[PDB]
Design a protein around this ligand. Structure first.
Ligand SMILES: *C(=O)c1cccc2[nH]ccc12
Ligand SMILES: *C(=O)c1cccc2[nH]ccc12
Ligand code: NA
Ligand code: NA
Lengths: 305, 305
């Protein structure tokens, strides 16, 4: 019993974190095999902020301008290259702690664990969702650049996020591990802002299923709805459209609880229209949308790695 | 910016988890140096549930009745002893991954990270508080017995909780790592239930300070209160009494925000009396009490390990 915001165990990622310094800028990097991945922002100075030409900044650098520290050990940089908004520093030492890994670009609505780091040292671990607006609601201070987000599947770390920047509303923007931003963001100083966000409807339904599995039914009702009629209410409350693919993905939770997806949609419609009348669901007075259907199955079935 | 339920990085603990089997019972153990710690329940059969005499059950065991597996490696048990409600199995191999560590018995209101495990394999990591009633609101399935709770301080893992059992309301009970239960619970089948719980008042004030640090002031007011008058309202809403020690512990957050502790108490009193009028604080529509003052400072100052 119980239902928590549960991160993956972080040990496989902790062993990959390093500190990268160029000039007076220090941030985190990810050491896999003999490569260190980090935000290309590390080559900027406090002037190369408004319109940096990174190709021009990087051609002016030598391997020796990059200091990489793993614990209290200095790794010698023997090659450097830029891929989109990441820098790849080839080092003279393969990481003996390199886990089985992949790089994956996730869809909005997917969740991942963040290992927040400072100066190449892990600080803490928490669960995030990629928002529909391609931001994350993280927790990052100055120095957290190059902190990574990941999922674990049996033996294999899927890296999906590298942190770059904080936007004016205090939400966060970053890249895949090939250096492509999520969303329209750029690594320069502009008036860029988070777009309007929406609630992840399939995740809210997953979490209502979690609540039933965990022995709570107060919010259920005897009604059903059509997908089309549900989506007309979704739109009114700034919820993502529910697709047939989302209905299919909820099939396993539907089967385990004996509650049809469109019946759970009718519960959600009543919750949006009426609110909770001072009641809670899994300890929350709001409708939670940062658990995927896979996250619910994992935490109700006890899969390990 | 941002504020998350943040766990400690789990790698130092992952390297200590093992599987222990006695008869048909399998659960998790903690391998530190050449000792494996696990719940003494592992020696019970489905009959030794109502009134087990553990001393009598254990004298009937041989070292060879205990199977300890670290990854796919079997550790030979060379000695066994019982300390309160834990079993200590001496093994022929020291854990080469043993971190710097301590065993600590925490106070109610303190928080810790749980590494939920099954079959000696870590599943996930989340933050918990020890409730005033000496339960935790965890997330544990069958097989999670012997999962541990911990805090990390620089280089040093402080183990504070070993999981034993689920109580009828779906909350959890366990021991310190010397095998003493938190609360009045026993490792036998009885009508034991969680006592009435209360809200951790000092933690709610810490989290209101977090909300100010993170740029939110809507709930503040121009009033102050006396400690005595605040506690008369605390009592009405089933909040823990606020002590002068709690006031002293909030001093650093008070100093950083320029909001006197008793002024923040006046904000909390108004929130209890009026509710939030459909507003949120740090993404929550309820008053959060599972962040200590130390947890707020850590996540607003960026301490690492
Ligand atoms: C940190 O990597 C980073 C990336 C883009 C912009 C920025 N400003 C400060 C720090 C950064
Ligand atoms: C698991 O360790 C444990 C301890 C006490 C009681 C109990 N019942 C089932 C599992 C347990
Ligand atoms: Na329904
Ligand atoms: Na006040």
């Amino acid at each position: 019993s119980g239902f928590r915001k549960m991160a993956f165990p972080s040990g496989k990622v902790e062993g990959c974190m390093v500190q990268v310094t160029c000039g007076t800028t220090t941030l985190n990097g990810l050491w896999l095999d003999d490569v260190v991945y980090c935000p290309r922002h590390v080559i900027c100075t406090s002037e190369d902020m408004l319109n940096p030409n990174y190709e021009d900044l990087l051609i002016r650098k030598s391997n020796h301008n990059f200091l990489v520290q793993a614990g209290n050990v200095q790794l010698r940089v023997i090659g450097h290259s830029m891929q989109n908004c990441v820098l790849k520093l080839k080092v003279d030492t393969a990481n003996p702690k390199t886990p089985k890994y992949k790089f994956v670009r996730i869809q909005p609505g997917q969740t991942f664990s963040v290992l927040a780091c400072y100066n190449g040292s892990p600080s803490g671990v928490y669960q995030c969702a990629m928002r529909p607006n391609f931001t994350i609601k993280g927790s990052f201070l100055n120095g957290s650049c190059g902190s990574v987000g990941f999922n674990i599947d049996y033996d294999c770390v899927s890296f999906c996020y590298m942190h770059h920047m904080e936007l004016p509303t205090g939400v966060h923007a970053g890249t895949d591990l090939e250096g492509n931003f999520y969303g329209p963001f750029v690594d320069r100083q502009t008036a860029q802002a988070a777009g309007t966000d929406t609630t992840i409807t399939v995740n809210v339904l997953a979490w209502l299923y979690a609540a039933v599995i965990n022995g709570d039914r107060w919010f259920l009702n005897r009604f059903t709805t059509t997908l089309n009629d549900f989506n007309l209410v979704a739109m009114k409350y700034n919820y993502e459209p529910l697709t047939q693919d989302h209905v299919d993905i909820l099939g396993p939770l539907s089967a385990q609880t004996g509650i049809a997806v469109l019946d759970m949609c009718a519960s959600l419609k009543e919750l949006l229209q009426n609110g909770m009348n001072g009641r809670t669901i899994l300890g929350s007075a709001l409708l939670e949308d940062e658990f995927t259907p896979f996250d619910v199955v994992r935490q109700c079935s006890g899969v390990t790695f």
